[PDB]
Design a binder for this molecule. Structure first.
Ligand SMILES: *[C@@H]1O[C@H](CO)[C@@H](O)[C@H](O)[C@H]1NC(C)=O
Ligand SMILES: *[C@@H]1O[C@H](CO)[C@@H](O)[C@H](O)[C@H]1NC(C)=O
Ligand SMILES: [Zn+2]
Ligand SMILES: [Zn+2]
Lengths: 236, 236
């Protein structure tokens, strides 16, 4: 079983899957982590510029333990450095936790530079009592019925990020420097996580969960601290 | 940080918390596991007798990363061996997965014999689109507003298991022999998991999630297979 979440294919043994995954197991700045709201840094106001232009239907694919939209119109400007949008995707349950609390879902918008430096913009989802939703993501999730098998793809509706955008702009942004949450867990990723969760509906949550199944990396040691697999490796 | 889920206090380093936790790290039959519905054994019909008599309000306590009801009126008879009820409690997200799919919540009813042999009866929860609930668990969850702090306790309403009972009786029961999902992860636990998830409401899920935060052990290697920490233990 290749790049999985289960057993021998899962995070505890990604390094054993291919030596190119050293970071996964030896990294001292691995992601996800448990964010301590009263301890992280918050992106300073006006240090972060997120551009997400209206897009036409785009490739939504069943990764197999994953659900990803491919989209290349978008940017994130962190002070002087500009990253351009590669794709966005979903995890269920969330990968990060806040004050130890997890969430039913997390979105990752992945950006890069020509130097292949990476930055992420993430959002947390929280089930809405009142049935509220994010039309953007409704639009994204609409076609899921078309891609039940891993390795198949389809096309979303028009993606309008107006709402997402100014949600991101109206709220704080947890910021830290970590890694990819998938192999090879490359470090030096710039993490930017909106502090305020988006509405999610039961219908949507179940729809997605059934496709993705489970695709979250367990949380890591604190930043700088030994990868907590190397910690476990003493013994013996 | 003592018996946690976060970093140094979490499952990857429980053994390092106290030598009495060897199984956590060296066990070949650790729980939870990913259940493969077309591969596990189903409890044979009439091999399992679950008795849950009506109960008065009982001690609901905030474990800290846990929510547990203490109750001693109940039994589970597995052929000729009778286990008596110690307590039941909740995990969010679920700890087990079915065909790799996780669930927002799992309940554990823990039973024992005088030989301190253990058996569990577990139920999966799935968010109900239509707002449906299990009155039993509604009754259990009612008082949560009283126990925000870890180490505090309160008292449930009357607990009537009529519904739960015959749900358990009307459905299959995944069965396998594993371990405790908490230290010291003692092995030889008799696992019995109802195949059919209970209704859960957004209101309830969020209420609980905020109290428990996150309290699920990552899934283990297959049964008999090396604990997948010992697997990770090559090298350094
Ligand atoms: C990306 O931008 C270009 C330039 O405006 C445009 O031609 C194209 O439609 C955009 N891509 C999508 C899929 O919206
Ligand atoms: C347990 O059983 C005893 C005897 O039936 C009964 O008096 C008592 O109410 C029960 N405990 C609770 C809290 O329901
Ligand atoms: Zn991701
Ligand atoms: Zn449990």
């Amino acid at each position: 079983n290749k790049f999985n979440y289960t057993g021998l294919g899962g995070p505890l043994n990604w390094y054993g899957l291919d030596e190119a995954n050293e970071a996964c197991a030896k990294g001292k700045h691995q992601s996800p982590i448990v964010i301590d709201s009263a301890a992280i840094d918050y992106a300073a106001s006006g240090s972060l510029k997120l551009d997400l232009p209206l897009a036409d239907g785009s490739k939504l694919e069943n990764l197999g333990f994953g659900l990803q939209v491919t989209l290349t119109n978008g940017s994130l400007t962190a002070n002087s450095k500009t990253y351009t949008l590669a794709q966005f995707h979903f995890h269920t349950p969330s990968e990060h936790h806040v004050n130890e609390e997890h969430f039913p879902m997390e979105v990752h918008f992945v950006f890069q530079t020509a130097a292949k430096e990476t930055a992420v913009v993430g959002f947390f989802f929280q089930l809405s009592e009142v049935g509220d939703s994010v039309p953007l993501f409704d639009s994204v999730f609409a076609p899921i019925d078309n891609i039940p098998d891993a390795g198949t793809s389809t096309t979303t509706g028009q993606l309008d990020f107006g709402g997402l955008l100014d949600h991101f702009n109206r709220h704080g942004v947890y910021q830290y420097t970590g890694s990819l949450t998938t192999p090879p867990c490359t470090e030096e990723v710039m993490w930017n996580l909106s502090t305020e969760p988006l509405p999610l509906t039961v219908q949507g949550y179940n729809k997605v969960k059934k496709i993705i199944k489970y695709n979250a990396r367990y949380t890591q040691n604190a930043l700088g601290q030994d990868n907590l697999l190397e910690v476990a490796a003493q013994k013996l």
